[PDB]
Amino acid sequence: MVSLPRMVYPQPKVLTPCRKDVLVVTPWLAPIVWEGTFNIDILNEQFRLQNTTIGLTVFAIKKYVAFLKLFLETAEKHFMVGHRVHYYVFTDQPAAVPRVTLGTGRQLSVLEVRAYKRWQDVSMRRMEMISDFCERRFLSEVDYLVCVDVDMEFRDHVGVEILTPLFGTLHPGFYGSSREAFTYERRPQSQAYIPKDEGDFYYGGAFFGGSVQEVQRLTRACHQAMMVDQANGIEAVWHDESHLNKYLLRHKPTKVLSPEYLWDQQLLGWPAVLRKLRFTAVPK
Amino acid sequence: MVSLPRMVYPQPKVLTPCRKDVLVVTPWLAPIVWEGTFNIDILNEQFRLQNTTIGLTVFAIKKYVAFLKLFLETAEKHFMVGHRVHYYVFTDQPAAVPRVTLGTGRQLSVLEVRAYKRWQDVSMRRMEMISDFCERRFLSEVDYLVCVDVDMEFRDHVGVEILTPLFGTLHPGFYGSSREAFTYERRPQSQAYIPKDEGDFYYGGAFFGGSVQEVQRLTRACHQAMMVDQANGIEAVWHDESHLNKYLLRHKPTKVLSPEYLWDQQLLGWPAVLRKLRFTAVPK
Numbered sequence: 032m033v034s035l036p037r038m039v040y041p042q043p044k045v046l047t048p049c050r051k052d053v054l055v056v057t058p059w060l061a062p063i064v065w066e067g068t069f070n071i072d073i074l075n076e077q078f079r080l081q082n083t084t085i086g087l088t089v090f091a092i093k094k095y096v097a098f099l100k101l102f103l104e105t106a107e108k109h110f111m112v113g114h115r116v117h118y119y120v121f122t123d124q125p126a127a128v129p130r131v132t133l134g135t136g137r138q139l140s141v142l143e144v145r146a147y148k149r150w151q152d153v154s155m156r157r158m159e160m161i162s163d164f165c166e167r168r169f170l171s172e173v174d175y176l177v178c179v180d181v182d183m184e185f186r187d188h189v190g191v192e193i194l195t196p197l198f199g200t201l202h203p204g205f206y207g208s209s210r211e212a213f214t215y216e217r218r219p220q221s222q223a224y225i226p227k228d229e230g231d232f233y234y235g236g237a238f239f240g241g242s243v244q245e246v247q248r249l250t251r252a253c254h255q256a257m258m259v260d261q262a263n264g265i266e267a268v269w270h271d272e273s274h275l276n277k278y279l280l281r282h283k284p285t286k287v288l289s290p291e292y293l294w295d296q297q298l299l300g301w302p303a304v305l306r307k308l309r310f311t312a313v314p315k
Numbered sequence: 316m317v318s319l320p321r322m323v324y325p326q327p328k329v330l331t332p333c334r335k336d337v338l339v340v341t342p343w344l345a346p347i348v349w350e351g352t353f354n355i356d357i358l359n360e361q362f363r364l365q366n367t368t369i370g371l372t373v374f375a376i377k378k379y380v381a382f383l384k385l386f387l388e389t390a391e392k393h394f395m396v397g398h399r400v401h402y403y404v405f406t407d408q409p410a411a412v413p414r415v416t417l418g419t420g421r422q423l424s425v426l427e428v429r430a431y432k433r434w435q436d437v438s439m440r441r442m443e444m445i446s447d448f449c450e451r452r453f454l455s456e457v458d459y460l461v462c463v464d465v466d467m468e469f470r471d472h473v474g475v476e477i478l479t480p481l482f483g484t485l486h487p488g489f490y491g492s493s494r495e496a497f498t499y500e501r502r503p504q505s506q507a508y509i510p511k512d513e514g515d516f517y518y519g520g521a522f523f524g525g526s527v528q529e530v531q532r533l534t535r536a537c538h539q540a541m542m543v544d545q546a547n548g549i550e551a552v553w554h555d556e557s558h559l560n561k562y563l564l565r566h567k568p569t570k571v572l573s574p575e576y577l578w579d580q581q582l583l584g585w586p587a588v589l590r591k592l593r594f595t596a597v598p599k
């Protein structure tokens with residue numbers, strides 16, 4: 032990496048934590064990203080100097096096309112502003128994608144794919160489709176991939192602080208829960224099985240990412256695991272999210288995002304521990 | 316990575332920090348390594364699965380050969396035990412290197428180099444010498460390089476928790492100090508110059524490291540800066556440490572080690588904030 036320029040900002044204080052109310056590093060030394068833990072000016076410098084391109088995948092199959100306008104418009108206000116962004120919209124209805132005005136250095140591609148009848152299958156098949164397009168396109172077109180649900184909107188900054196070889200996001204329903212309470216797949220017959228004495232966190236299927244290489248590996252593995260389960264007459268309790276959790280248990284993420292990055296205010300309010308609500312559920 | 320095996324350990328608690336008394340992550344999201352922040356079993360698994368080899372460089376020029384016996388014997392007890400280790404002892408007196416019994420998977424190489432007259436030159440020229448041998452040997456022989464002073468002994472675990480592309484260590488004299496008090500080079504004529512309003516930390520010249528590529532970059536850059544200074548007729552106030560600090564200001568380390576890793580118990584005692592004293596000064 033090339034040198035940063037002179038910058039003036041508050042000195043970090045070794046004997047003064049940024050946050051004392053939350054865990055800010057995992058036991059494998061991956062940062063857990065909360066507001067107050069990062070200086071976004073330093074991080075922007077680091078990633079801009081490397082001319083980073085970020086891909087964002089989103090699936091808008093069947094009626095879910097209705098979520099695209101707000102998803103994309105709010106993404107324009109909050110997601111990686113100042114950096115190169117390439118949106119990839121996976122849909123069975125190219126003509127139904129709204130014409131959203133994009134900022135400079137940002138582009139959008141529509142990837143036409145099949146629709147599945149069951150929402151579970153639409154959700155699950157994202158793994159296969161992302162993996163497939165890593166090979167077809169993403170490896171050549173972007174440096175990182177961020178893979179999210181479409182039934183969401185950005186309300187605050189989501190930026191290069193999340194970028195790392197592999198990240199998961201704390202599910203907003205479980206961040207304060209004991210591992211026994213996590214809704215991992217519990218049947219040993221399933222490839223997603225995690226027993227009650229294992230597990231670090233419950234990650235949300237709605238927001239993960241990393242380098243293209245790591246996301247390719249993750250999505251390929253989750254898809255293969257789902258195909259094995261299918262052959263064994265089993266479907267994991269929480270579908271792709273169950274498999275995501277099994278993957279990230281055994282392949283530790285190099286950053287973990289706090290629930291600021293995946294929230295539902297209707298269901299969970301605005302707890303003191305959340306200084307910002309960045310990416311939130313839209314009522315559906 | 317390849318998958319980790321099933322492991323049983325206590326669950327990380329999102330709403331319960333491991334350490335509330337110290338900063339455990341930098342504003343650029345690099346872990347600051349303190350006892351309690353890492354699970355060494357997880358980390359050992361990760362690095363052993365990668366067949367990691369760690370190089371350790373140490374200079375024992377002139378009278379400093381006296382320190383080698385204790386340095387090496389204690390390294391055998393505490394440094395990277397269980398992993399492949401390659402010691403590189405730089406000396407003007409190959410015959411004076413004590414014969415120290417090494418554990419399996421550990422090797423020692425004696426590198427014969429010139430002895431400079433001025434201690435300042437001895438200390439400063441380590442940068443050139445490390446950089447030269449990165450090309451000569453380290454690139455093909457080790458994955459990471461750890462570069463330390465010889466007038467030291469290991470007293471507790473120093474392991475794979477430190478490994479990362481680039482690391483510096485908090486100097487024990489300044490970890491609680493404001494940047495204005497840091498003994499950076501303050502003369503603008505010097506390549507190591509840092510203004511009073513810049514600076515994250517004061518890093519110790521006695522303990523830094525990283526991937527071979529990053530250590531080659533750092534040591535080459537510091538040597539070049541020193542040569543420019545020499546041509547301009549100036550020598551930085553704290554020699555190689557001043558240049559190391561300039562380098563790490565502009566090239567942020569991906570981990571920072573706490574003063575557990577670089578201490579002087581005679582001068583500073585054993586404060587409560589240090590749960591372990593791992594690598595400590597030998598009186599001289």
Ligand SMILES: O=c1ccn([C@@H]2O[C@H](COP(=O)(O)OP(=O)(O)O)[C@@H](O)[C@H]2O)c(=O)[nH]1
Nearest residue numbers: 090091092093094095150153154180181182
């Ligand atoms: O008919 C569907 C069902 C699902 N999805 C995609 O699959 C994601 C996950 O589904 P959903 O959001 O309904 O799951 P939930 O958040 O309720 O767990 C959605 O965001 C969409 O991106 C879709 O496009 N069309």
Ligand SMILES: O=c1ccn([C@@H]2O[C@H](COP(=O)(O)OP(=O)(O)O)[C@@H](O)[C@H]2O)c(=O)[nH]1
Nearest residue numbers: 374375376377378379434437438464465466
């Ligand atoms: O005559 C010398 C002077 C320096 N050194 C090496 O340079 C390092 C830095 O010097 P020193 O330890 O004296 O610096 P200090 O810790 O006192 O700042 C030493 O640990 C030795 O490894 C050496 O080998 N011989």
Ligand SMILES: [Mn+2]
Nearest residue numbers: 180181182237
């Ligand atoms: Mn959703």
Ligand SMILES: [Mn+2]
Nearest residue numbers: 464465466521
């Ligand atoms: Mn020393």
